[PDB]
Structure 1
Amino acid sequence: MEIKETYDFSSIVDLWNKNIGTVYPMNLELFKQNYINDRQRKKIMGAFNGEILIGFVIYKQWTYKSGSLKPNHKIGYINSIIVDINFRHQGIGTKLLDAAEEELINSGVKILRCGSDTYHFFPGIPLECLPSEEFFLVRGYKMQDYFYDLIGDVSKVDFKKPSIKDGFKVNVMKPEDRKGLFEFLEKSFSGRWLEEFIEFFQVGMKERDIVLIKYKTSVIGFSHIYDNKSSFIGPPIYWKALLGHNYGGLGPIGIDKTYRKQGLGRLLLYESLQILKKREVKKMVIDWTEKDIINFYGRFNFMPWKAYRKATKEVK
């Protein structure tokens, strides 16, 4: 049995599907999009029985800027780790993670995160992988709080437009909005979301995927919406195989800090959902939310669908 770097994305996608595909159906298009476009120091280490892949770990160190933020090289990530069901409890997971962790630690990592990377597949350890929590505990990861993906069927319900002060207006992004959008993100969301707007617009995100809220001529918030015409496959639609026809998704969404708590996020969400509804979307996801924000989406009939546990190892 040998541990070595692996390049065959198709073998990895198949092992993924065979083992967890019922709840996290992967495809090669998604896998390639997220692995290839990632800008971090990244690697896939495989475990092999002769020519046969029997396990893999995908892992990263934070080495590329996030908008205006410098990378923090002390942070590394376990994107994913799967050992094939016929080869469990032989120490292969341990070997794979020993290798990955040792590499990361030797390049200066002090904090190891389960998921939550750029171009992640998971915000944390999925509930469907709850038995792995013990695997991670044995290695010194600490189990923290939860994040959720929410689901709802926007075709089944109608809501009254929430009330708002005069002077605000929501519309799908137009090409001439790009400069205003970027100025707004540099001001209000100048880390990860800024970085993602920069990068995602280079690999197929289109203006039709973005909804903007303005106060008069100024951009004061946005959402990213998804349907089956989106070219860029973002987190709300990763698991689109589970969502049926006319799937969609919404996330992230953000309102300038000075404008928060006046009902403008509710208005943006409402109008974004109306857009999707008129696009004939049915089941759709809201990705990677926190418990205290579920009810914001809940009032629009979204419910928790998937849960992920944050988990962190501090290097001694």
Structure 2
Amino acid sequence: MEIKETYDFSSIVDLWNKNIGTVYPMNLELFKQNYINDRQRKKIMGAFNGEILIGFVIYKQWTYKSGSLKPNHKIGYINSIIVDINFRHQGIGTKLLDAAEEELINSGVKILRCGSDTYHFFPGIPLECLPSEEFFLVRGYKMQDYFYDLIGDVSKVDFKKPSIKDGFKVNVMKPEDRKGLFEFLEKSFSGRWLEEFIEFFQVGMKERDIVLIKYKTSVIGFSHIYDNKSSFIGPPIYWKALLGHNYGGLGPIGIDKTYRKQGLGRLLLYESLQILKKREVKKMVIDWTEKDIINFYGRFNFMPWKAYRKATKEVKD
């Protein structure tokens, strides 16, 4: 067996689907979008028996800015790792992660994260990969708390408009709103979400995918919505193959801190879902939520669907 670099995306995707495709169905469009467009220092290492790919790991170091946040070179990420089911418990996973980690470490990484990267596939260790938690524990990763993708079928329920205080208006974004949107993001959400807006606009997100809430003329919050016409495959619709026809999604969503706890998030969410419902969306996903916020979406009939465990390894000095 040999470990070396591979960018044979269709062999990777094939191996991905054979092993975990039931619950994380991958397609080449999504795989290439997320790998190729990522701006971090990144690599894919494969394990090979001659010409046959039998495992891989994808890994990154934080070298490119996230909005106003500077890149912290101390942070590295394991985007994914899979060994084929017919070659398990032969040390191949260990060799792949040893190679990833040793490279990262030499390049200055002191904190290693399971998923959560830019252009991630997973916010953390998926519950469906719960047995890998022990694999990571053996290597010195510590298990932390959970995040959740939520699912709901917006075609099946009617909701009541929350009671509208005056001056506030919710509308899909127009091209001329971009200036104001970026000023709002620089003020209120100036890290990863600011950078997603920059990147996603570069890779095919359209104004129709963004909903803005304004007080008078000022942008005070946003949501990102997705349907089967979106040109960018974003995290809510990564697993669209499980969601049937007329799939959709929502996330992220935020309100300026000085306007919180007035029912304005609930209004923005209500209006965002009506837009989707009018676009004939049925099953849709709200991705990468914390436990404490689940009930905010659950009033609109969303339920937890997938769970991911955050996990972190501190490199010893």
**Shorter chain as normaliser: what TM range?**
over 0.9
Distance 2:253 2:232 in 1: 17
Deviations 1:137-181 (A, max 9, x none): 000000000000000000000111111321100000011101100
Is 2:131 the partner of 1:131? yes
The alpha-carbon deviation at position 7 of structure 1 amounts to 1.1
Aligned residues: 316
2:173 corresponds in structure 1 to 173
Distance 1:164 1:180 in 2: 23
Give structure 2 stretches of 5+ with no counterpart. Answer: none
Distance 1:105 1:34 in 2: 24
Deviations 1:183-213 (A, max 9, x none): 1001111110000100110110000000000
Distance 2:261 2:35 in 1: 37
Deviations 1:291-310 (A, max 9, x none): 00000000000000000000
Structure 2 counterpart SS, 1:146 = strand
* Alignment RMSD (CA, Å): 0.4
Q: Percent identity?
A: 100
1:155 corresponds in structure 2 to 155
Deviations 1:62-108 (A, max 9, x none): 00001111101111000000000000000000000000000000000
Structure 2 counterpart SS, 1:178 = helix
Distance 2:199 2:62 in 1: 16
Distance 2:208 2:216 in 1: 21
Scaled by the length of structure 2, the TM-score of the pair is: 0.99
2:255 corresponds in structure 1 to 255
The alpha-carbon deviation at position 228 of structure 1 amounts to 0.1
Distance 1:255 1:74 in 2: 31
Structure 2 counterpart SS, 1:155 = helix
Deviations 1:236-271 (A, max 9, x none): 000000000000000000111111111110000000
1:277 corresponds in structure 2 to 277
Distance 1:314 1:152 in 2: 37
Range 276-285 or range 252-261, more displaced: 252-261
Map 1:82-121 → 2, pairs under 5 A:
82-121=82-121
Structure 2 counterpart SS, 1:151 = strand
Distance 1:49 1:66 in 2: 38
Structure 2 counterpart SS, 1:201 = helix
Scaled by the length of structure 1, the TM-score of the pair is: 1.00
* Runs (4+) off by over 2 Å: none
Distance 2:216 2:272 in 1: 19
Structure 2 counterpart SS, 1:24 = coil
Give structure 1 stretches of 5+ with no counterpart. Answer: none
